[PDB]
């Protein structure tokens, strides 16, 4: 078919980017980051190895206290507020980039990330209410 | 005005039927009842809370039932400490503790 | 666990006023309210009050709203989850039909529909 | 509303707890904790990041080998039993917290490890049996 | 019962070693790997914690582009190519061992993990093409 590699869909509509997502989840981790020897090239190569790892689970954290973990494209609860972005559907992934879209929406992703992590806390909290019969 | 049982008795095996109901004041739809064991002049003892919810450590013989207009408390296998004067109490989240008149057992 | 021991029972005559001591260990005293109940001779055993160690707040009965002053102070850390306090008792336009045993008791659970239940009663004291 | 903040409710009722966990749950692994040098505090500061995300892994894995990926509040088919503690509900939830709870369950904690582990184990191989038609 | 500890069954067919998988997931991130001494033997210890956490999380990485986040057992909608072995299920699930088993599929396991990444890409796009409605 295609696949435009790792970044490929970068200037693609959001659209089509988000068919290709495993293409960018796989090469969050491995790359080429046996023994630990303290050199100038040691020391730098420990480094690389143990900022993937934090910044792989920082995402996952996230990902998880908002019931997606394990999951490329997961749908939540949250509407959204046309004070974000007035933007209609058509328009946006069909036409923006994602690099694009996050320039634009940057604002507003600290207050969209606390609407989704209480509606999982509220969440959880209703199936446990509804398992109790 | 939560009018208890005169009084009763019963025998070692059997059981009793305490009753506790008054207006539309006090009882009972809307408020929980409460049951307090209260030997004459002495430590009282909870007994049963929020129209049949037991005390951590009372006998599983005890129990509570609420009809719409009067609450009651039933006392199963009877011991020789039954013998001791039990009041009921008729309250909300935010209120008193309207007491019950007395009933002797 | 958690004790409640209480005052003297000493008598006085009408028109006094007389203090009622509680004295609490093995819990911590902030955590449950503390009520006053009074069992007289002549009357059916009568709710007074209870009283918050923690938020300070009191409600009485409207029989007694302004007849008492119930007061409690600050808890004293034996460790983590054990504490020991003290509350007040105070009756105004006091006559002789007052006359019973007084007994002070901590509330049952610290949320729900039966927070301030009294739960756990002291040894209650004589009067005149 | 209330928003106690960090370990806020840590004297509040198990109930009341049990409701701010993602308070708790964000704060496990980001904090203040760019190049790799080899000095006293250099030193110091990796070791304070791969501690952390160690002690963060070995709750995700047992959160993973009981059935609860990504949960904050998830239920099992392991009874409760008694011996560990006949404290009733109301009496519990609307009375104790966290910290004397666990103080008093710590005998037992690694007992009820073990029953979750293997209902696990046995779950999901129900689970393979019954979409083998 | 039986109890074979860990990699217990590592002689046993491969059926019955698979209801034993709790036991080999718990000790692989655990085992004995508190300040950090850059010594001969410390700067040893910090090699053995980052690689264990490296390790363990390109396996679970591989576990969620499949949709089998927090699995021991997770079943695929990728059918069984007879090219990659022509056994049957009684001549493999109660005869052959996990070893020897992987083995003789070792060749195909780069090929199957393809086709198992893009099967859970497109499974979660047909699942929020339905909750569209
Ligand atoms: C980089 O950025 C550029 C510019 O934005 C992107 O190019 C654009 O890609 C989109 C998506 O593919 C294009 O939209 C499609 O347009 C076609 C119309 O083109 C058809 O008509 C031509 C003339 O009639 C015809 O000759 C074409 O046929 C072949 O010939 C050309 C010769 O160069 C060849 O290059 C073609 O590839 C063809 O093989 C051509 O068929 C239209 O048909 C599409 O509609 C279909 O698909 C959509 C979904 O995609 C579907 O909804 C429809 O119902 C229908 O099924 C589609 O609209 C766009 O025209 C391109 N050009 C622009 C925008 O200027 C490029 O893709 C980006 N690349 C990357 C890697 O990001
Ligand atoms: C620290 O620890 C302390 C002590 O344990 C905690 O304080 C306790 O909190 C619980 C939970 O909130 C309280 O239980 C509630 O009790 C109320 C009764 O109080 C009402 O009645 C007063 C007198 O009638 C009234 O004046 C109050 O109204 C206002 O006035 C005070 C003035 O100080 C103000 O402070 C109040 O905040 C009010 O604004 C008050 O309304 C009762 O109504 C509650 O029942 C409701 O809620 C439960 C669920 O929570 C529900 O099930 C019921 O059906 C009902 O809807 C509830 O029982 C308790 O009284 C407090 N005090 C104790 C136990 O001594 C404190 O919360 C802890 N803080 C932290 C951070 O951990
Ligand atoms: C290491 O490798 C060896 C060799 O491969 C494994 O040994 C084999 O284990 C399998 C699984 O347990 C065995 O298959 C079973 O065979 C029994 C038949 O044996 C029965 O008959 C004997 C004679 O009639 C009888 O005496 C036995 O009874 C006891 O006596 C012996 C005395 O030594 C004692 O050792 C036994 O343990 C018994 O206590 C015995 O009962 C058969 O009954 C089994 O069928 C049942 O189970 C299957 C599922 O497992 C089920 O589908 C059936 O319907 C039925 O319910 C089962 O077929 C095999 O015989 C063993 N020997 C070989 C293959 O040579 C060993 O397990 C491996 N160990 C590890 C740790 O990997
Ligand atoms: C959108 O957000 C603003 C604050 O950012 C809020 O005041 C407003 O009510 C929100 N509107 C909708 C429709 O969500
Ligand atoms: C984001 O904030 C900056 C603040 O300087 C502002 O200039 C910009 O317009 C804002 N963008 C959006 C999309 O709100
Ligand atoms: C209760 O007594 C104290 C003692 O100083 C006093 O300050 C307080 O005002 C009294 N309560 C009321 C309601 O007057
Ligand atoms: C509780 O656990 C003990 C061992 O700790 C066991 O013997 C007993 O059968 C168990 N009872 C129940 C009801 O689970
Ligand atoms: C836990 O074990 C210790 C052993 O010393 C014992 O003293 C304690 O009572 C036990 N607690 C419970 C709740 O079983
Ligand atoms: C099996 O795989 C080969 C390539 O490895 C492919 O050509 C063939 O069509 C596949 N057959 C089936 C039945 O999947
Ligand atoms: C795997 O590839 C090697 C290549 O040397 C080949 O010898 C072997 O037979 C292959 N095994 C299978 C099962 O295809």
Known sequence: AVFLGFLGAAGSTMGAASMTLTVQARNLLSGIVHLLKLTVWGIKQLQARVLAVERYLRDQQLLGIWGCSGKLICCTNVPWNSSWSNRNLSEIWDNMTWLQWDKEISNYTQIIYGLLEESQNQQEKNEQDLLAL | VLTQSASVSGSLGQSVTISCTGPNSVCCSHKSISWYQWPPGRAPTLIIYEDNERAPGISPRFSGYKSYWSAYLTISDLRPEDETTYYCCSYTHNSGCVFGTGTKV | ?128
Chains 1, 4, 5 share one sequence.
């Open chain 3, 1 to 128: 666990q958690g004790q409640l021991v209480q005052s003297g029972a000493t008598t006085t005559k009408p028109g006094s006023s007389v203090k009622i001591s509680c004295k609490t260990s093995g819990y911590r005293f902030n955590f449950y309210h503390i009520n006053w109940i009074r069992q007289t001779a002549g009357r059916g055993p009568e709710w007074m009050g209870w009283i918050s160690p923690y938020s300070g707040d009191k409600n009485l009965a409207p029989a007694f709203q302004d007849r008492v002053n119930m007061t409690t102070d600050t808890e004293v850390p034996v460790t983590s989850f054990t504490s020991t306090g003290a509350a007040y008792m105070e009756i105004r336009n006091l006559t002789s039909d007052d006359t019973g045993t007084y007994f002070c008791a901590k509330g049952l659970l610290r949320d729900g529909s039966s927070t301030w239940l009294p739960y756990l009663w002291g040894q209650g004291t004589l009067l005149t």
